[PDB]
Amino acid sequence: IPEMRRVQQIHFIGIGGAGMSGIAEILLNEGYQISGSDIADGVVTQRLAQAGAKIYIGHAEEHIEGASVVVVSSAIKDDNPELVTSKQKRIPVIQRAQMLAEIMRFRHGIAVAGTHGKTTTTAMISMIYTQAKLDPTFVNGGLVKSAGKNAHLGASRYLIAEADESDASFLHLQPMVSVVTNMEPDHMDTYEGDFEKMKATYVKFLHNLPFYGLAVMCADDPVLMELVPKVGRQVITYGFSEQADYRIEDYEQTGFQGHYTVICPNNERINVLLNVPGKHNALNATAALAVAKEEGIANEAILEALADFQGAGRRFDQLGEFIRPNGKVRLVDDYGHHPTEVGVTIKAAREGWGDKRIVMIFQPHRYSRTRDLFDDFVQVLSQVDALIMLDVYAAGEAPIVGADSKSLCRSIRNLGKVDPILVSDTSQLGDVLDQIIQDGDLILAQGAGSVSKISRGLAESWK
Ligand SMILES: C=C(O[C@H]1[C@H](O)[C@@H](CO)O[C@H](OP(=O)(O)OP(=O)(O)OC[C@H]2O[C@@H](n3ccc(=O)[nH]c3=O)[C@H](O)[C@@H]2O)[C@@H]1NC(C)=O)C(=O)O
Ligand SMILES: [Mg+2]
Numbered sequence: 001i002p003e004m005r006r007v008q009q010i011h012f013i014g015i016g017g018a019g020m021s022g023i024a025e026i027l028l029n030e031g032y033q034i035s036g037s038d039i040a041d042g043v044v045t046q047r048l049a050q051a052g053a054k055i056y057i058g059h060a061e062e063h064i065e066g067a068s069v070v071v072v073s074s075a076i077k078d079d080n081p082e083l084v085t086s087k088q089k090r091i092p093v094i095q096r097a098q099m100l101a102e103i104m105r106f107r108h109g110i111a112v113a114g115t116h117g118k119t120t121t122t123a124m125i126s127m128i129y130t131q132a133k134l135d136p137t138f139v140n141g142g143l144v145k146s147a148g149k150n151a152h153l154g155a156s157r158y159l160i161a162e163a164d165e166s167d168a169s170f171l172h173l174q175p176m177v178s179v180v181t182n183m184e185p186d187h188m189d190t191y192e193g194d195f196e197k198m199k200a201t202y203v204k205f206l207h208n209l210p211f212y213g214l215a216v217m218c219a220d221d222p223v224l225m226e227l228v229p230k231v232g233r234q235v236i237t238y239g240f241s242e243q244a245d246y247r248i249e250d251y252e253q254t255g256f257q258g259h260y261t262v263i264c265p266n267n268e269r270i271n272v273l274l275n276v277p278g279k280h281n282a283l284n285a286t287a288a289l290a291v292a293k294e295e296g297i298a299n300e301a302i303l304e305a306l307a308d309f310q311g312a313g314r315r316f317d318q319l320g321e322f323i324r325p326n327g328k329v330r331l332v333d334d335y336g337h338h339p340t341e342v343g344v345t346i347k348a349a350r351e352g353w354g355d356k357r358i359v360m361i362f363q364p365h366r367y368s369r370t371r372d373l374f375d376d377f378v379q380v381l382s383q384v385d386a387l388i389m390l391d392v393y394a395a396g397e398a399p400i401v402g403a404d405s406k407s408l409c410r411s412i413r414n415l416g417k418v419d420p421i422l423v424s425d426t427s428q429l430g431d432v433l434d435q436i437i438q439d440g441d442l443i444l445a446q447g448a449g450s451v452s453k454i455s456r457g458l459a460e461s462w463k
């Protein structure tokens with residue numbers, strides 16, 4: 001891995017970002033001087049600063065002093081003072097994915113793309129390669145829990161990276177192996193409502209593979225299977241489908257572990273214990289197993305990693321067990337924010353929780369999304385046994401009338417399967433929970449916004 005010519009200091013605008021911070025950590029550990037700004041100081045920025053990155057909170061033209069190159073998050077606005085000034089001083093300004101691509105350039109890149117499951121799959125592959133003693137570099141879009149970080153620099157040529165389709169930015173990447181987990185409507189503003197344009201973009205992405213490259217694609221996704229003829233690279237499939245190259249059979253969930261068999265292309269049978277719940281994770285783990293098997297990694301390494309898998313951050317993220325005045329409860333944090341993904345989480349919980357109650361704390365992310373998927377939210381949220389609603393996490397959006405938490409609560413109440421409690425002052429969340437808790441409750445803190453931080457504050461106080 002060569003040093004980049006004349007690159008002394010790399011400045012990140014929005015350095016606390018999930019993807020931004022991983023790249024900064026890689027480059028810091030490679031020996032580059034790292035600076036960055038963010039509007040918020042948290043665990044991520046504190047870790048980077050402690051490691052030796054120069055972090056500023058707030059944006060100012062002075063923050064870019066000394067930068068050889070500026071890396072910008074998609075979250076950053078065009079009026080940002082650091083961004084405007086960087087261009088004025090003729091300092092290269094590049095997107096996050098272009099810098100990830102440079103990390104990938106001289107590495108054996110395994111890019112994990114798809115709508116859902118990318119963070120878990122990337123973590124799984126990372127852990128398999130680690131267990132195989134291959135000492136991979138990885139850059140994930142969320143925590144690899146066993147690592148306690150989103151990214152890690154290994155001494156090998158291997159790179160496992162989550163590949164973001166959301167701005168077509170994964171087109172910068174030049175991988176050796178590309179996983180596509182699935183394809184569903186998301187980030188449609190970048191694709192202008194056109195599902196076909198997204199389809200074309202994924203095909204374009206797979207065309208970045210070398211002629212000898214490998215695409216590992218989910219056999220259970222009809223859209224992905226229709227795209228196989230257009231790939232023009234070797235395609236290996238995985239899933240429950242009888243036509244899958246790596247076929248999952250005999251799946252059972254016991255508690256929060258999965259048990260199943262994978263039948264490989266040469267009919268080799270592999271009995272898997274997977275340390276995370278749900279058929280959806282069996283799929284993610286079979287993408288990971290397929291990648292590893294195709295790379296030549298021994299079953300021992302694959303099985304050990306999957307059996308010990310500690311999960312990805314906020315993906316059915318077990319926060320612990322707590323004795324409360326009204327019962328012993330289990331708290332779990334999950335990122336799921338689309339109705340189908342919230343449904344998957346509820347299913348995984350149900351299949352591990354027997355006859356005990358599932359209590360959900362749900363925070364809708366965006367008024368726009370709440371508006372657009374309102375009825376679907378009403379239906380999926382109505383599946384839980386007790387429901388606490390938090391106010392919509394606006395993420396910069398102006399309120400939309402009829403698309404707030406009060407409106408969701410009304411509609412759910414009126415459906416009559418569950419009677420939701422709206423909690424606006426989240427300092428009261430623990431008290432509301434304490435009032436309604438029963439022994440053996442599973443409490444699912446659900447959503448993409450501040451709900452995770454709120455749930456961890458709750459956990460901490462309950463310790
Ligand atoms: C788009 C997704 O989310 C992720 C994706 O998972 C990962 C990995 O691929 O790369 C991107 O993270 P990222 O590291 O660029 O940024 P995010 O994790 O969204 O956070 C943005 C960061 O910018 C900061 N920020 C935002 C606005 C601002 O004016 N100033 C500022 O400093 C925020 O405080 C935050 O710390 C994607 N986010 C965006 C906005 O592009 C997705 O997965 O669908
Ligand atoms: Mg996404």
Ligand SMILES: [Mg+2]
Nearest residue numbers: 383384385417
């Ligand atoms: Mg019910």
